Structures are given as structure tokens and as C-alpha cells.
Amino acid sequence: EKKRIEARQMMDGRQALKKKHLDLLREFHERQFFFWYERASERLQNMNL
Amino acid sequence: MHLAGRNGRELSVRTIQHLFARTDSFAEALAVFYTMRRCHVAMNMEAYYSMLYSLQRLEEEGWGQHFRNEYEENGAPSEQAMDFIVKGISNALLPENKPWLGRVMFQDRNVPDRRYDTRDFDELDTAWTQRYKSG
Amino acid sequence: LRYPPIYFIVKRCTLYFSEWAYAVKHQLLLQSPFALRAAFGLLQEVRGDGAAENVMPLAETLGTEFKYFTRLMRRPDFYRVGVHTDKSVEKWEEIKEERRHNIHHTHRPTRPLPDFEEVFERDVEIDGHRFVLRPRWNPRTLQDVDDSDILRLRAPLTYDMDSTAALHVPTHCGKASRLAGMLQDAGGVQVLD
Amino acid sequence: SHSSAMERAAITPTRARWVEDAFADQPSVNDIMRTLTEIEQLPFQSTHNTSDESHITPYTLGSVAAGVQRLGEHRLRYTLSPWDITPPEDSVVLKHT
Amino acid sequence: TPEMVLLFIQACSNCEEPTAVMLERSETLIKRLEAVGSSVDLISPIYDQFLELCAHLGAVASGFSALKRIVGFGKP
Amino acid sequence: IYAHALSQFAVCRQPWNEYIGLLTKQDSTPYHTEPQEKPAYRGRKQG
Amino acid sequence: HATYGAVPLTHSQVTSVYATDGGKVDELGLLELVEERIFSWKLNKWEMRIPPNLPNDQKELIRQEQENLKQILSEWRKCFGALNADILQISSLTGVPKDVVREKNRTWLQEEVAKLRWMGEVNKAALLRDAFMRLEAFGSRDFMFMERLCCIYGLARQGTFDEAFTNYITEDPVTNDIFVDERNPFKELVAHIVRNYSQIDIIYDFLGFNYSEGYRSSLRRYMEYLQCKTAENVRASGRLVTGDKGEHNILFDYCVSRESLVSGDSCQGIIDFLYINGNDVTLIIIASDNPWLRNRQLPHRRQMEGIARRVCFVLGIPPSEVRIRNLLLPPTYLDKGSIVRLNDIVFRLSNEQSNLLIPWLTNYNKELDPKDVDYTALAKTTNEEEWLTL
Amino acid sequence: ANHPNRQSGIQFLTHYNTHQRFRVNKDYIDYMHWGKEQGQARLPHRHQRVAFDFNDQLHPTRIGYAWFASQDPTFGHHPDLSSSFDPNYRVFSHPEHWNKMFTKRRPGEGDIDLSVLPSRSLLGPLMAHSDTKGIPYFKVDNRGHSNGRVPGVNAPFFGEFDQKMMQAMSRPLN
Amino acid sequence: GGPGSPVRGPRGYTAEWRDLRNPMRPPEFPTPWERKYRQ
Amino acid sequence: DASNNRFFRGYYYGQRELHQLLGRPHSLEATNADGSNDLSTYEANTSQ
Amino acid sequence: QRNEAVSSHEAVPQTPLVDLPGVERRRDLPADPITRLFFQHKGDHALYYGTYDKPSVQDDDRVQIEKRVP
Amino acid sequence: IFDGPNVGITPYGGMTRLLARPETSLKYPGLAEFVVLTGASLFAGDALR
Amino acid sequence: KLSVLEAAQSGLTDYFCGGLNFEIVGFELHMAAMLRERAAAILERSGACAMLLEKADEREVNKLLRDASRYEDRVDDA
Amino acid sequence: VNIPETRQMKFEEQHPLLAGALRKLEGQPKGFPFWYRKYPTRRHAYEYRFSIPVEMLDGYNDDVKKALSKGMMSIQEKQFAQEAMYMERYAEHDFDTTSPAVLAVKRALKCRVLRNHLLTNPHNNIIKTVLANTERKLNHALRRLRKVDFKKYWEIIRDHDVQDI
């Protein structure tokens, strides 16, 4: 039982870390989209001419 | 900003953050961003995050005034008002409870959210001057 | 300011005797006066006349140093102010924030918490020296000390004064882990009224 | 492969003489303080006020270009250089490359 | 479908004695279909009929909440 | 805080790699020459 | 035993079933008598104690609680036996009566050991000295008064051990007469407990004996009671207990940290209670049992600033003076050190009325276990280790 | 093994999914040109080796001096710190990349893939030329270094250098 | 008696704490133990 | 059982099938003797 | 062990005292960040650590040993 | 670095004997007092001297 | 043949061998001082190792003094 | 292929200020990407070529809009757009690219495309083998999804009333 509760706490910690990893990946994707918009804007400006 | 660009001096991050913190409305913030783009300034993730913080705090102030009205009219705060007080804006961009999103160069940037008076901006400069003169 | 300011630091490629003396005096004033006197007394007690024989051996040197350390650590100047002076600025900021935001760490803490303003006094002037931050020693200056305390420090260690046994380094290295065994072999301690 | 100048020392002979003049044979902290105070008022023109090669504490960065690069981390850099920011006096019509 | 939900709201509004259950049923149907978002610009008649049902019932809070929601969405 | 008096001495480590590289070398050529390729073990049957 | 119709009593009905009033009750005497009867019991007396007809989902919890109480009583039994052995040995060596051995002075120990050593029985003198030292260390008749009282209260709450202390055949060794005793010390003891300790359930949950989501609802009720006593007007709507007076005396029950932390949406500012006194705001958080999540249990400084700003916006409090503070509480129980700081800092409760409102505070001496000492020491994490650790 | 197509050997010191190098299908040996600095052609490359000699440098750490201020001022860049070091850096091999067995092996034909080697054409930078600055300026990376804090790379480096793995290969007695 | 044999099975001070005494204190019964055997 | 019997600790057939059935993460060189790296979700969450 | 226990035995069962936040943590074994086969990852990232079959992303500067599979 | 008095305690460790050696007092008079009071740091070159 | 003694720092610190941990020494000395001052306060309250006529006050004073002496013994052992 | 409007409704519900800003700035050039939360990934914007969101093409000419419209997408681009549209309706979240449901829908669409290509030209034994392998992977993904949930089955298997896969 003691080992069981220890493993349960470890799994809760790992699940929380996985959720934080998903959040960080979301932030990274948003940053990449922000950079892409800045880069793609000028190409459409050139394509507008 | 045209004169600044012509002289070549670069606008500092804290100056931009306070500039976006002083804004009143979303239209005003958008006009400021458009003017900065027109003045030939290369946008950065710090500037984008400052804009996002300004939007979040605009909505935060709106909700705060809305709940202030109900508190004044009733004489007692409501459960929704308490929940908003605790958890901020419901599903807001760059949520405050998790401070690992609004970070640039591993440093959190939450300056452009609360209104700054003529003294709050000056306090940092006075502290730096005192540190220079003392240590 | 009528014009924008620019900040420089001026560093001297060569120092003078007066400047070195000023630095030494500044350091002496900054550090504890009672500790300075105790250290001077310890040094002169260890050295003695200065002859090659009058200098205490390593064992006696360690014994006298232990005597001085035990006699001085009971003073609040050590464990209340002195031990907290070496914390970094980041550590001090963490302590300030933790005290300002925590209740359990401030009112009735199970672990003692340092106080920055209780251990440091700010912007003190001492005979022409400006200290932006100086630790708050109970004997603030060297003129506020007593020679009777120094005499009692130099007095030999006795169990009546501070309830601390004398230190003998080689026998502590040798028989400390076997003292109980030797006592049991002897037959135990005889208690006589 | 060892030079007396290349060893890390802080008791250079001038400092050794300073120590022997300010601490030696002074059996009192009060007397040491009095001696230090007396040495304080030595004018720079005094012969006894001898100089020494003071080791310079290292700078944080060490180069002006490095300092400018570090300072630029907290600024937003314009797309165009300051000299080409201004519009030209000659009329130029934008067009595809 | 938008036609299906509009027809149900019309039935439960123009019928007789829609006292309690029908208001809650309309509310849950709206809160379930809006998530799928099948109707975005054709939901104006749906909200008009919902407001008519609220008028028949007499409730002011639900009607004002619906009006605020639609004006926030962008319906004139 | 306390390092104000300590920094006055400012005694620092002297260079050693520079001294090692600039001391007189027993094998020094006026013009540096890149050493030629040494033979390698091509394989079991090659050698 | 637990026959058909036996139901585990709750706090509301235990006070009703035990309502006999006694003018004079020997609080310690009845406790000692019931404890010695429990010690004289056998291991098979705990078998038919679980009420028969209950769902297994709560039957497991009932069995766990009964096993916990049995283990605690067995643990205390050996300590009591050793203490009684020391007292008997001291009485045999000295001749002093056993009843007054309990409260003898160290000066008396000095003269007794001196006279024994003079008589030459050095072994007896040393044995008496060490026995008296340990008896002084663990000699209080109220060594764990709240713990023993809460154990008795839980035994009563089980609603099966009431009839056990009855119809017992005992004989007087001096008289040699044998009689069946029908007296029930447990009945009068629990009657005294429910007469005096009105918040016995709160103490029982604070000591950590409520494994089924305990120590949380009891803490909320304790805070509500303290607010009601320290104030005069109260409106309790669900999770918000507020005073309509001008001073902002507001208590808010946000959520349950234990469930919310593991449910999802990994955050850092998960709190349990929010109490505003009109000048200062306090966030009271029960620490999580998971050490990995206990690090992120505390809210960030940015979140603290946001909470202060939002309170200023809503309540109208000027931002010039807003003291926002955090309080951490042990996960499995509640100790005296935390209770005193909760009473002193969170509320305006003073010492003069502290004992007035909490008569059992003087007898509450629970201290943090060595496993629970470090519940508040959280290692700092750098900004570049967000991916790696919490 | 004298059988053709099995000259690769049975080398276990590779990182491939099987110990049979001639049976693995990840990287194919170009016996005619490989082995310039790694001896035989069948041996693993210098950037893909898991066995190290006593007098051979280990794999350099990729940093992607600033942090050696506390150390000897004249100490140059650490030889074990490289700014451009790719562990799984594919090398050009004729049998896998420039294959000509289907045709008559004439000088003008042969199946070629351009993914192995970065494009040297000037078309690259011209098309990928932007008025706005690059990724390091835009700061789109939030992970940073894979490890949390590296005293050599992320943080200032203190202590003394340890070239040979002595403190890093030791057993605690306490 | 090895591991194949069936298993033997498993606040204050216990009952076995009282008999234990520090060897520094004199023994209860002065049995003349040989010093070599004592070591 | 697997606690005090060598024949019940056979991995690939004695214990691998049981681990697959019960959801325990299993590996050949597992930490536990039976062959499971860690407890299953039900085992971790629920007491027995 | 028995000899040490009886030697250190006390007539009173002394209770444990409160210490600093931590003096009992398992110190990480020393390593050189510059010249290393692998980074000595500290034990505080046990959540980030994975398993042999499904390792996490770490020591990316080096090649990764692929498991042998029939 | 002895740095005793600045922490509020006498220096401890046994270096006082080395400072009070007659050789030290002969080569550099006053060095022992300077080190024990000011808490200065002696380097490898100083120890060699 | 030779016993080398050194410090294995991973670049985190540059020290070879620091002194006895002054942080922990000051912590335990402060704890002992607080225990002694609380014992003195309760002793003077009772008057208005130590031996007191009141049994509970004597017991708590003895416990506090014993714990303070244990802290001092820890410092001495260091 | 078109994006479901549940995404627009969810965005408007979650972020009222940004949605109102977009609605009031419709037809006006915009220098800040308000739709970043609306488009978390590249594959989530398949209406226009090169993952260009609809809102970005606002201050540009109708010629550029037409050139980036759906009518100028390649066959591979159309296949990827349809695949993304189907995957986003089954993914548990925006980044869900490993769940058996999304794997199964992706493999089913790829199998359909391979079957159509083989019907056109059947002389590709490589295509036959890869279609068999993709069918095996789809079968495995569905067998795995069976135990985790079957409501998704009664939602997805009604496509053409297969009921026998």
C-alpha cells in the first residue's frame, strides 16, 4: 500500500508535467505562427505589387 | 518615432511596455501598433507579448468596473465576483495562474498590465541612480 | 539636469599608501569590533613571545581556537547578525518576498527567519567613513567594548563558566568512538557523593 | 617554466613594507587604529606615501562592441538603417522585383 | 438543423401553457446546438422566436441574457 | 555589500596559457608547417 | 456486537443518544478506567464491530477507521504498561505510595537516590533514577488528552462498542466476593465528552482521524463559527459567508485543492479559502500530499499582485494599503502551531477571547511529525527548468 | 565472412537496431570513398561512435569566452565546445544517394537525391531574405537548452576544468 | 531453517526499553567477565 | 505465487500475459521481479 | 550495530529535533559539463525521466543507442 | 581565506599557528595580525613565499 | 601509494573546502537560544537543568533545557 | 472543403474582445494577428494555400485572393486539406495527432486516395503493397479504438453504412 501511494503520487506528478509540456508546445506553436505572419506578410506585399 | 529612427536610437523594451500600458482602449492600442509599424520598427515577440498583455488587462479592467457596479448597487460582493477575483479573466490569453507562458529570454514580462503613474515609472530610475551612487 | 547624464567608473591603475590604509581602516570598521579584539587576543596568545619554542603546537593551537570559538558563539552577535551577512542579493530578495507573502514563516515559524533591517543598519557615519550598509553588531564601535570580557575569554576553559569540556584533538581522534567500550571494560562509572 | 612574476601573490614587497609599517609590533587594536588614522592624512606628495602597481578588478564585459551588443538585447531594432530611413530626394516608384 | 431548432422553438412558443419545462428545454437545445455552430447568420429568427417565447412566459432575465449574447455575437 | 573592501585589493589570476604558448620552444620553426597526413589502418587485408 | 439494525452514528445523533447529565464527572478517572478495560480486552473483541448492512464502498472506509483506532489503542497500550511498570518499580524501591509517585519532585528524587547510594544499593539507586527520569518525561495524566478523548469519541461514533463495557464478572481480591458489574464507564465518559467538548468533532477531524475527505469541511465550519463569533451580522450563501457591515468581513470557499490539483488544468495558484478582513486578504491553502505538486501549490508573485489588483478593483479598497498574505496548512492534520497562527494573523482574534471561544486550545498540544516537518520547505526552481521540473 | 555483401562485419559498437551491419538498412557503407579519417569504411563515423580510446577526444558539446571570465583570462575557447556539431549528420554515400546501377553507368545519368547535402545555390539566401531579423532576434524558442542549467553553456563556469573523465566517472563512498 | 522454511513473521517508550542500560553505567550484576572476551 | 515460487516468475508466458491483461507497463528487464515496470492505473488509484 | 546501539542508548527516549529544510538529500554525483559522455541529470527531474522503451529527449548532442530487435 | 572576525567569530582551523610561526613573523612582520584582523586571503604565491 | 584529496565541483562552485556550515550552525544556535529564552520566561512566570515546585512547569522547563542542550551538543559535535 | 463553423463559434465564445475586434475590422487591413488562437497549427488553416488564414487576406486585391483560393490548390494540397478537415473533427484537442480516432480517419482517407489512384493506374505494385500496409495499420488503429470508446464508432462507422469493417 505504501509503495502504491508513492507510485500514485509519481504518476500524478508525471501527468502534471505532461500537461505543462502540452501548454509549452502550445506557446511554441503560437510563437512560430507569430513569426510566420511577420515573414509571410512581406511576401504577400511583394505579391500585391 | 520618425525622428528617433532617423537619429538611430533604439526604443527600449521597458519604454515600449509602459507605452502600451498607458493605453485606454483597444482601438487606441491598435493605432499605436500601426504607428509603430509605420515608423519602420521590426516587431519582436516582446512587443507582441506587450500587446497581448494590454488586451488582457483592458478586458480585466472592464470586468472589474462591471463587478464594481454590482457591488456598489447591492452592498455585498457576489459569488461570480469572488470567483473572478480569484481566477482572473475566464480563459484569458497568457493566463496569470501559469507564469510559464509570458516569458521572453526566460524572463517574465508582466509590466504592461497595470496602470502606471508619473511616479511608478520614475521609481525604477531613481532606484538605479541610488544603486549607482551607493554601490 | 540641464543635459543628459552619462555614467563612468574611475579605476586607478596604481594605489597609494594612504588609499591602502583607508581601505584597511574601512574593512576594520565594517567588521565586528568585539570579534577583532578576540581575534587579536587569540593571535597573541598563540604566538606568545615569538620564539620557535613558545609557539603552541598544532594540538594546543586547535584547543585555544576551539576555546575562543565556544566562548564567542554563545553571544547573540554571532548567530543573530553575523551568520546572515554572507547571503547573496538573490537570497535576501527571496527572504523578503517570503516574509512579505507568508504567514506561517513570520508569526510563529518553526524555522527562524532572518530580518534584513534587524541585522543591517543603513547609511551610518563612523569617523569620516560612510557605510551604505553595515551589519548591526551589538558593540557598535571599538570604544564600546570591555577589557574584562577579553580577560575572561583569554582565561582557561572551565566547565563552570560555559559548560563545555576541554578539547584534546589527538585523543578525540583516537578514543572518541571507543570511550563507551573502554568504560564498560573498566566496569562503569563510580558515583561518589 | 616558472617566473616570480607569474605566481599569484598578494604580498608584493611594497605591500609587505606597508604591512610591516602599519601592523608590526603594535600590541593593541586601538594603537593599530591610531596608526591607520595617522597614515590617512599622508599627502600624495609625501615620500613615505609610496605607490604600488594596483591590480585592476576585471570589468564585467571587457569590450565596447560587446557592451553595445548586450545593451541591444533590451531594444527594438529598426528594419532600416538610420541613413536609409529617410526618403530619398529623387522620386522612386515601387514595383515588383 | 437550424430549421429543426427554429421549428421546435416556434412550436413551444406559439403553443399553450409553456410554463416551465419548455423554457429549460429551449435553453439546453440552444446551448447544445450553438456549440456545433450550425447556424451563424440564420439564427436571428431563432433568437427572435426565443425572445417571443420569453415574452409569453414573462421572464426578463433570460431574455436580457439572450439579447446580450446575440449583440455580443454581432446580430443587430 | 561586504565585497566593497575586498575589491580594493582586486588580486586576480595571472595568465598561464599565454605564458606557456609564448615561452621559448625547443622545437620552433621560423615558418609554421602543417604536418603531413600519417598512414592509417585501412583494413585487415590491406594493412 | 454489530447485529442487525446497528448504524454508525454521526455527530448530530451521538450527542442526542448520549444526553445524560452528571453533576460531577471524573474526567481523567473515567478515561483511565475505560483505557484499562480496553487493555484487558482481547484481540477478538474487535471482530463483530462493522455494522452488517452497508455498501462496501463505505464499508471499506468504516473498516479502515476501526483498524486505525485499534492500532492506535494497541500502540498506546504498551506505553501505558511500561509507564505503570516504572511506577510500580519506583514504589517498590522507595516505599512511597503509588498514587503519589506520579507527582514527585526532582528534589525528592535527589534525596531518595542519595539515601540509596548511602545504603550501598548503587544498582537500585541508578534504576530508580532512570525510572523517575522517564516517569517525569511521560508522566502526565493528560499526556495526550485530546488524542485519548478523540479515540474514545471515535469508538463511540462507531456505535458498536457501547454495550461492551457491561455485564462484566469481577471479584474483589480482598473480599474474594464475585459479582457481575453492570456499570458502563463508556456511557458516562462519552456523555461528559458531548456535554463539555461541543466541537469534539472538529478536534477529531483536526487530529487527522477523518480519513474520508476530512479536515476540510471541519476547517470550513470552524472558520465560519469563528467569523460568526467575532462578528454580529452574517449572510451565508453557499460558498460565500459575508458580513453586511461596512468592514469587509468576507469568507470564500473557492474549491478543494486535493481534487482540483489532480483533475486537470495544471496551475500554480490553486487555493482553498479566501478571507478578507476589510484591510488584509489571506489565502489559506491546505498543502497537497503529493510532494511534486506541493512545490506548485503556492501561488506565484505575479498572481499575488493580480489578486491584490482585482481586490482593489472590486471591493473598492485603496491599493495604497492592501496586505495580501498566504497561509499553508498541513495536509493530513492540523497542529497547534498552525492553529495559533490562524487565530492570530488571519483574524483579529486576541488572546483574551481566544481561550474564551476555544476552551480546548490549552489542551491542544499536537506537533508536526518528522515526516511532516518539511511540508512548507519548497525548493526553488530556476526559470530555465520549466520543461524539466515543476 | 568471405561472402560478398557481408564485408560490413559483425560490429556491435554501432548504434543501429541490429548488430549485423550488413543486415541493417539505415546507413549503407561507401567503401570507395569512406574511411578518410576513421580508418576502414565499415567502422562508424567520428560523429557516430560509442567507443572511445584513452588518447582520443570525446564528442564535443554543442553550444549553439563569455562564461570563462572567472577562469584564466588567456584561456581560449575550450576545445571540447563546438558551435556546429550534429550527431546524426548524414554523409554523402554513392551507393545510397548517387545510384547508377539501373542505367548503363554513363557520366550523365544516375538517381540522385539532394536532401543529403545542404544546398550551395545562391537561390537559397535570396529567396530566404527578409527585411525582418532572424530567429535569434525574434526569440521564438522557449525550450532553450535541453538540460535545465549547464555551467559551461547556460550559466557562468566556476571551479576547475576536468578534461579527462575523473570526477565524472567515480563511485560515492558515503 | 533457510529461506525455504516457512516465514517466521514480524508516542513513548516500550517495555523492552526499560531493561536496556548504557554500558557506561555500572552493570546491575558485577559478573567478573574476562577483558579479552569482553572485547 | 510469484512472491515465493521461481516457476511463477516466468516472464514471457507466466507473467507477460497477466501484465497485458491487467494493464501494467511490462518490460523484459523490469524493475519488479514479476516483470512489471510499474503498477497499473487501477492499482495506483485504488486501495486493496 | 547492536554494540553501537547499546553504546548510544539513553535512559530517556529522546525525540527528534527540527533541522534545516534539507541536509538529507542524495547529492548528485559529480560530472564535468564540458567534457562528458552524457549530462549528469539531477534527481529532481524524476517526472521528466522516462523509461528504457520510450526514453525522453535528453543528451541530444550524442547519438542514441537503438534497442536490438529480432 | 580565514575571514573570521567579519562573521562575528574568531578564526578557526589552525592556520593561526602557521601565521604565528617565527618564520612568518620574520619574513613578513605584521602579516599575521593583518590576516587575522582584516580577513585577507593568502594565495598560492603567498604560501610559497 | 598516494592518497590524493580534492574537490569535485561540476562548475557550480569554485571552493575547494569551505568551513563548517555557518548557516546550519547559526540556525541551531538560534533554536537553542529561543528554547532557553522561552524556558527562562516560563521559569520566571512560575517563580512569580532547573527544579521547580510545580510539577508541570518543572517538566516543561526541563524539556526545553534538554532540547537546547541537545542543540549545543550538536554544535560541539560539529 | 470548408472549415466547420463550430471553430468560429468557439473562438467568439472564448475571446469576446478579439472576436468583436475582427468583426469591426472586417474589410480593413490588419497589422496584428488576432486569429492566432483561432489557428493554433498550420494544418488548421486549409481554406487557402500555404496555411494562409482567411482573415489575413483582407487588405489585398481580389486577384491575390483568387490566386490563394481553393481553386488553385494542387491535388496533394486538396488531399491534405480534406485530411486536416476530417482530423480536426475527431481530435480530442488541437494537437491531438496520436489518438486512434485521428490515426484511423487519416489512414482511411489515405486508403481511399490510394484506391482511387490504383483504379486509375493499377500497374504500381509499390502502391498495392503500401495500400495493404496502410489498411493493416488502419485495422490496428480501429481495433485499439474499439476498447477505449464505441460512441465514436457509432458516430464514424455510419459513413456509407459500412458496419462490416
**For residue H159, which of H60, H68, H57 has the smallest C-alpha distance?**
H68
Q: Which amino acid is at G43?
A: L
**Location of C-alpha cell 477529531:** G204
**From the list B43, B45, B98, which residue is nearest A23 (CB)?**
B98
In chain C, which residue's Cα lies nearest the Cα of B131?
C132
Estimate to the nearest angstrom the gap between the alpha carbon of D77 and the chain centroid.
30
Distances from the Cα of N154 to the Cαs of K13, N103, N151, N159, in angstroms? Answer: 68, 17, 5, 10
User: Which residue from K27, K57, K62 is facing H87, i.e. has the nearest CB?
Assistant: K62
Q: What is the sign of the dihedral through the CA atoms of G231, G324, C100 and G326?
A: positive
CB-CB under 8 Å, K21 with C110: no
| C59-86 as b/e: b if 16+ CB within 10 A | eebbbbbbbbbbbbbbbebbbbbbbbbe
> Are residues C110 and K18, on separate chains, in Cβ contact within 8 Å?
yes
- φ, ψ of residue C130 in degrees (nearest 5): -105, 120
**If you measure CA to CA, which chain D residue comes closest to L43?**
D9
Q: Do L11 and C65 touch (CB under 8 A)?
A: yes
Instruction: Inspect the interface and report whether the beta carbons of M59 and G105 lie closer than 8 Å.
Output: no
Record: contact G307-B99, CB cut-off 8 A: no
Q: Which residues of B touch N38 (CB under 8 A)?
A: none
**K44–chain C nearest CA distance, Å:** 21
Say yes or no for a CB contact (<8 Å) between C180 and I23.
yes
Q: Which residues pair with H98 in a beta bridge?
A: H112
Chain K interface residues (partner J, CB cutoff 8 A)? 51-53
Contact J39 A7 (CB under 8 A): yes
Whether residue B132 and residue C7 make contact (CB cut-off 8 A), yes or no, is yes
Contacts of H70 in chain M (CB under 8 A): 14
The answer to whether G131 faces chain I, any CB pair under 8 Å, is yes
Given a contact cutoff of 8 angstroms between Cβ atoms, the answer to whether H53 and H38 are in contact is no
- Please name the residue of chain G whose CA is at the shortest distance from the CA of residue M54: G105
Strand partners, G178: G171
DSSP characters for G197-214?
Answer: -TTHHHHHHHTT--TTTT
SS3 B12: strand
User: G64: distance to nearest CA of chain B, Å?
Assistant: 36
Look up residue F10 and give its DSSP letter.
Answer: -
Q: SS3 of M74, please?
A: helix
What is the grid cell recorded at H69? 571570465
CA dihedral N103, N105, N111, N116 (to 10 degrees): -150
Q: How far are the Cα atoms of C162, L17, L41, M62, N13 from residue C46, in angstroms, in the given order?
A: 21, 7, 20, 39, 82
Chain D residues in contact with F20 (beta carbon < 8 A): 1
Q: CB G333: neighbour CB atoms within 10 A? A: 19
> CB of N38 within 8 A of CB of N11?
yes
Half-sphere exposure of G202 (CA within 13 A, CB side): 18
L6 touches chain F (CB under 8 A): yes
Of I13, I21, I22, the CB nearest to K13: I13
Cβ atoms within 10 Å of C16's Cβ, excluding its own: 18
What grid cell was written down for J8?
A: 511463477
In whole angstroms, what is the distance from residue A3 CA to residue G326 CA? 32
* D54: number of Cβ within 10 Å: 18
- Cell numbers representing residue N90 in the block: 475527431
Establish if A38 touches chain B: CB-CB under 8 angstroms: yes
Question: In 3D, which of G16, G23, G30 has the Cα closest to residue G189?
Answer: G30
Question: For residues L12 and L1, is the Cβ–Cβ distance under 8 A?
Answer: no
DSSP G102: T
CA distances from N68 to A41, N30, N56 (A): 14, 18, 11
Helix (H, G, I), strand (E, B) or coil at I12: coil
Regarding chains H and K, contact by 3 or more CB pairs under 8 A is answered as yes
Q: What is the DSSP pairing of strand H81-82 with strand H61-62?
A: parallel
Are the beta carbons of A9 and G290 closer than 8 angstroms?
yes
**Do the Cβ atoms of H89 and H68 come closer than 8 Å?**
no
- What residues of K are in contact with residue I20 (Cβ under 8 Å)? 6, 9
Chain G CB contacts of B91 under 8 Å are none
Instruction: Tell me if G134 and K12 make a contact (CB, 8 A cut-off).
Output: yes
Q: How far is B34 from chain N (nearest CA, A)?
A: 7
What are the chain L neighbours of C56 within 8 Å (beta carbons)?
Answer: 17
Cα C188 to the chain's mean position, in Å?
A: 40
Cα–Cα distance for residue pair G273/G254, rounded to 1 Å: 6
Q: Is the Cα dihedral C95, C100, C105, C109 positive or negative?
A: positive
Q: Which residues of L touch D9 (CB under 8 A)?
A: 43, 45-46, 48-49
Q: Which residues of E touch N10 (CB under 8 A)?
A: 35, 37
Give chain J's end-to-end CA distance (angstroms, integer).
17
Q: Does A10 touch chain H (CB under 8 A)?
A: no
- Grid cell, residue A22, equals 502540452
According to the entry, how was the structure determined?
cryo-EM
How far is H159 from M12, CA to CA, in rounded Å?
7
Degrees to nearest 5, angle at CA G376 with G370 and G381: 120
HEC letters along chain H: CCCCCCCCCCCCCCCCCCCCCCCCCCCCCCCCCCCCCCCCCCCCCCCCCCCCCCCCCCCCEECCCCCCCCCCCCCCCCCCEECCCCCCCCCCCHHHHEECCCCCCCCCCCEECCCCCCCCCCHHHHHCCCCCCCHHHHCCCCCCCCCCCCCCCCCCCCCCCCCCCCCCCCCCCC
Neighbours of chain D (3+ CB pairs under 8 A): A, B, C, F, H, L
For H114, the grid coordinates are 539532394
Q: I13–G76: do the CB atoms touch at under 8 Å? A: no
Q: Which residue of N has its CA nearest to E73?
A: N12
Alpha carbons B44 and B47: distance in angstroms, whole number: 5
| Backbone dihedral angles phi then psi of residue M11, each to the nearest 5 degrees | 90, -5
Any CB–CB contact under 8 A between F19 and chain C? no
In a 3-state reduction of DSSP, which class is residue G328? strand
Q: What are phi and psi of G323, to 5 degrees?
A: -95, 105
C-alpha cell at A19: 500537461
Nearest to G268 by CA among G239, G304, G311: G304
CB B101, CB B94: distance < 8 Å: yes
